[PDB]
């Protein structure tokens, strides 16, 4: 049933979990007790922009990802329409959250317009760029800047174009 | 006592396309990468680790249409398999 | 007839360290990443796909010493498992 | 025995190969017939430089990687002490080799000094940089510039520093 906390996410049974723990030795990330763990996730989604086209359909993405991450056991913070500076501030605050200490993992989701260099902030234009680089995201979440997430999986998901090209070439059969 | 730790470890990034290339979004259906990711996470979180799920997502994009893209896994320092164990 | 193909697909890169960071080499023993890669390829090519072997290499570096580094997998567009099938 | 063509690489048995083909469906890269395939690999190693320290021990790396790739069934080209321009020329020539048409995969190995931006050529100095970027390697081997390797695994291995930092932080137990 999809009425449970995990919704439409297919459950891992007790026999399935033991099969995973038997096939691989000490090569799996440990998960904390369900009763006490405080898993955190952050979604930053930019839909409304100053100078570039509105991202219609972004609400569907926010809904889908929020519900999915909740299904997987994460408490989800949703932040919308931020500059690159605001995203940096938000990421810094996220890295400082006390819950990471009693968590086993985290998810970061970024959804916006994008260019080769990185992810567009709300104020982005060709004349005056407003870009958050993937490199900055990693730096803000690493062991130096986020010691609470040491040894813990940090999954970064980015929906954004990476340039203007169609990503295809032709060939003949 | 103090001990050394790697400055950067246990990361995985998953981008919607390859460098230089567009990523597609539908006005009512949302972003295809996001929708495809959710579907695969819902189906495979129970049995596959995250690296494996992301590979499956990439495979689903293999045959290119009018709106083509190839999601890319980036800067991976996962030292173990990350299983979500949904339900646990 | 012509058909569309992804411009960038079926790539995997494996770097000796994380960005910003040093990679170590011994004057007589050679580069540690290279030596470690060979050892793991020799042992695990028979049973594991390349993505899995690279993960194992990363794990072998997990505990940092005086000369620490964390190999990183980059820009992955492998849509399938790449098994070497040594002997075949 | 290590006297065979595969040397010290542990063999995949017929039962082990069928186990791999049964556990996973159509999610494995196809391998071409052993009798007819022409697998290619390229090693570029820079040991002797104009202005930066000599890479002692590089010969051990060349020996190890050459023998390993041969063990795995690849014909190995070894090129030494090249500028970034020479590496580009060598990569372009490699992408044009007719053998890739009757191959199922390739390996590229780069070994040199390195900085954040990329891989050092033989003439590299802080004043006059001589750098090959990872981005260029991908571009030269993609479907546009290397159509023969379409749908085939392209494995790039890079031994090189990526900056000056030790890669570590302290924590207390």
CA angle centred on A113, ends A110 and A118, rounded to 5°: 70
Q: At what angle do helices A84-95 and A134-141 cross, to 10 degrees?
A: 20
Given a contact cutoff of 8 angstroms between Cβ atoms, the answer to whether A11 and B46 are in contact is yes
* A22: CB partners within 8 A, 6+ apart: none
Spatial separation of the C-alpha atoms in residues D9 and D2, rounded to whole Å? 8
- State the best of D67, D155, D164 to mutate against chain C, taking most chain C CBs within 10 Å: D155
* Stated resolution in angstroms: 1.8
Residue appearing with tokens 């000599």: D54
B11-47 CB burial, b ≥16 within 10 A, e <16:
bbbbbbbbbbbbbbbeeeebbbbbbbbbbbbbebbbe
Residues of A in contact with B9 (CB under 8 A): 143, 150-151
Whether C62 sits inside 8 A of B5 (CB atoms) is no
Q: Which two tokens stand for residue A151?
A: 């040894």
What would the two tokens of residue A136 be?
């900055």
Closest partner residue to D171 among A150, A169, A171, by Cβ? A150
- In the A/B pair of chains, how many CB contacts fall below 8 A? 195
- Find residue A115's DSSP bridge partners: A118
**Binary contact (A27, C59; C-beta < 8 A):** yes
Q: Do A58 and B30 touch (CB under 8 A)?
A: yes
How many structural domains are present in chain D? Answer: 1
Question: Are the beta carbons of D170 and C28 closer than 8 angstroms?
Answer: no
Surface of C (5-44) touching A: CB under 8 A: 5-8, 19
Burial D27-58 (b: 16+ CB within 10 A, else e): ebbebeeeeeebbbbbbbbbbebeebeebebb
What b/e readout covers A44-71, taking b as 16+ CB neighbours within 10 angstroms? bbbbebeebeebebbebbbebbbebbbb
At B10 the three-state DSSP class reads: coil
Task: Measure in Å the smallest separation between the Cα of C19 and chain D Cα atoms.
Answer: 5
A150 to D143: CB separation less than 8 angstroms, yes or no: no
Q: Which residues pair with D44 in a beta bridge?
A: D79, D110
The secondary structure of chain C, three-state, reads: CEEEEECCCCEEEEECCCCCECCCEECCCEEHHHHHHHHHHHHHCCCCCHHHHHHHHHHHCCCCCCCCCCCEEECECCCCECCCCCCC
| Rg of chain B in Å (alpha carbons) | 16
Say whether D13 and C6 touch across the interface (CB within 8 A): no
Q: Residue B7 is nearest to which of A55, A134, A142, comparing CB atoms?
A: A142
Cα angle A21-D9-D20, degrees, rounded to a multiple of 5 = 45
Hey, which residues 115-154 in chain A have their CB within 8 Å of chain C?
135, 138
Structural domain containing residue A17: 1-173
For chain C, list the domains and their CATH numbers.
1-88 (3.30.70.1470)
Instruction: Name the minimum distance, in Å, from the CA of A74 to any CA of chain D.
Output: 26
User: Quick check: A168 contacting C, CB < 8 Å?
Assistant: yes
Q: Do the Cβ atoms of D9 and C86 come within 8 Å?
A: yes
With contacts defined as CB-CB under 8 Å, which chain A residues touch C4?
Answer: 168-170
> Which of B5, B55, B56 has the CB atom closest to D169's CB atom?
B5
Q: Is A22 on the interface with B (CB under 8 A)?
A: no
Subunits with 3+ C-beta pairs closer than 8 A to A: B, C, D
Nearest-angstrom CA–CA distance, D163 and D156: 19
- This structure was determined by X-ray
CB D4 within 8 A of CB C56: no
Say if the Cβ atoms of A169 and C2 lie within 8 Å.
no
Q: Which residues of C touch B68 (CB under 8 A)?
A: 4, 6
What is the distance between the alpha carbons of residues D38 and D40, in angstroms, rounded to a whole number? 6
Cβ of residue A61 closer than 8 Å to a chain B Cβ: yes
Range 59-88 of B in CB contact (< 8 A) with A = 64, 68-70, 74-75, 78, 80-88
Beta pairing partners, B5: D169
- Which residue of A143, A169, A171 is in closest CB contact with D169? A143
Q: What are phi and psi of B60, to 5 degrees?
A: -60, -20
Three-class DSSP labels, chain A: CCCCCCCCCCCCCHHHHHHHHHHCCCCECCCCCCCCCCCEEEEEECCCCCCCCCCCCHHHHHHHHHHHHHHCCCEEEEEECCCHHHHHHHHHHHHCCHHHHHCCCEEEEEECCEECCEEECCCCCCCCCCEECHHHHHHHHCCCCCHHHCCCCEEEEEECCCCCECCEEEEEC
* Spatial distance between the Cα atoms of A149 and A40, rounded to a whole number of angstroms: 11
* CATH code, domain carrying D9: 3.40.50.1460
Q: Please, are residues A12 and B45 in contact by the beta-carbon 8 Å criterion? A: yes
Nearest to A27 by CA among C75, B80, C15, D106: B80
- For residues C77 and B18, is the Cβ–Cβ distance under 8 A? yes
- Name residue, tokens 């979990």: A17
Q: What residues in D contact C22, CB-CB < 8 Å? A: 161-167
- Token pair of A96 as six digits: 């400082």
Answer whether A29 touches C (CB < 8 Å). Answer: no
Q: How far apart are CA A152 and CA B80, in angstroms?
A: 10
């Amino acid at each position: 049933t999809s009425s449970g906390s995990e919704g439409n996410v297919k459950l891992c049974s007790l026999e399935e979990a033991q099969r995973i723990w038997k096939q691989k030795s000490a090569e799996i990330y440990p998960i904390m007790d369900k009763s006490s763990r405080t898993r955190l996730a952050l979604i930053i989604c930019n839909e409304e922009f100053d100078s570039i086209p509105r991202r219609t359909g972004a609400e569907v993405d926010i809904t889908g990802m929020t519900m999915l991450l909740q299904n997987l056991g994460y408490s989800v913070d949703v932040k919308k329409n931020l500059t690159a500076s605001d995203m940096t501030t938000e990421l810094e605050a996220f890295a400082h959250r006390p819950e990471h200490k009693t968590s086993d993992s985290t998810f970061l989701v970024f959804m916006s317009h994008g260019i080769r260099e990185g992810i567009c902030g709300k104020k982005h234009s060709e004349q005056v760029p407003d870009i958050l680089q993937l490199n900055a995201i990693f730096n803000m979440l690493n062991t130096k800047n986020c010691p609470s997430l040491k040894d813990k999986p940090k999954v970064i998901i980015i929906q954004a174009a990476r340039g203007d090209s169609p990503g295809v070439v032709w060939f003949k059969d | 006592a103090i001990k050394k730790a790697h400055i950067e470890k246990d990361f995985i990034a998953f981008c919607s396309s390859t460098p230089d290339n567009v990523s597609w979004r539908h006005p009512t259906m949302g972003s295809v990468f996001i929708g495809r990711l959710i579907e695969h996470m819902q189906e495979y979180a129970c049995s596959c680790d995250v690296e494996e799920i992301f590979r499956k997502v990439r495979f689903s994009f293999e045959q290119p249409d009018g709106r083509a893209q190839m999601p890319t896994t980036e800067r991976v320092t996962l030292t173990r398999c990350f299983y979500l164990f949904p339900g646990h």
